[PDB]
Amino acid sequence: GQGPAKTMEEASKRSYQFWDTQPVPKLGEVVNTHGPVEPDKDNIRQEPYTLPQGFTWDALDLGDRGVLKELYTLLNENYVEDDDNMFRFDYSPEFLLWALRPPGWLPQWHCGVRVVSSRKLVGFISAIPANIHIYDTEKKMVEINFLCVHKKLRSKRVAPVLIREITRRVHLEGIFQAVYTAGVVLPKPVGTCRYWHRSLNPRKLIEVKFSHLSRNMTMQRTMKLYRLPETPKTAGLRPMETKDIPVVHQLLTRYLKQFHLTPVMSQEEVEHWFYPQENIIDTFVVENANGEVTDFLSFYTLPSTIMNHPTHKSLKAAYSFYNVHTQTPLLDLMSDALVLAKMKGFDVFNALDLMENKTFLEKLKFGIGDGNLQYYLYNWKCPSMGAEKVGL
């Protein structure tokens, strides 16, 4: 079961038995054109792809409470881990409904695999509809997320079946491009982003060995280094409300035009993705002295289970989402984000080096991480881009 590559040079040795069959550019192929890798198919396979004996397809109705519980349990026990098997993402059921039932979600795109004899859930992959702006093209695509194979099913070529089947189910709806991200290198990244980490509770992070002490730095020195103001400083910062949905959509739409890979959100999508839900998504807008909203910051909640630590069980992480500035300096906005996450009990504030994040990452005492996020397009050939042009 030949394994995944983390760097492009590691990807140079590997051969991709599955991805070589797919409409994606080859690694190292220099891309100077814009368009689909292959034309749209005008007749689509009607029958689901074959699973190995003893396994069967089942679309997961996440509105069924028990079924949503089956999915949370599969991901809680088999989804993305760190390399040293110390942390695994702890997606909550309400978070999964937020991520998997945005506007336009379809039941057949919650594609599960069950054991035939026991009906045990052992596989999953998902699509959600997404209008994507890529350079000079706006196209209706899907975003593929939550590909998961039960640990007992690993390295048996079940993921290619999940990918082909969700591809077929997307093709049936007339969509022929997709966007997705991964921590491994596959043919062929359109952009490579790096995680950065802002310690909020440095003692806990070092205790559970998420971070380490700097060579000659003490715990007492580290805690003083990362100490934050007790309350934000931007005038008029307050949580987003229903009345802010239009202006937040307006701010986000205009702000994203400067990047090359961005989503195109309807106002209903802005409501879904940004309206605050506790322990899921927080959005704060800046309302100035005239009553007009000029900026906003947002971050979502994604805790990680701590595998074996005697006193700590959960690593509470906030992930930077979208941060739009027109009147408040982005450095001030992200400084307030750190304070707001600290007040809310988060242990670490994660962000990528995409969009304009490089302008504040080092200044706000973020430290570079060891993990990258690779961005991909399915069936779309276009030049690669730097992280600062990625807005997805």
Partner: peptide, 7 residues
Amino acid sequence: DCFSKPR
């Protein structure tokens, strides 16, 4: 997201 921790 995939997993990362400070280098």
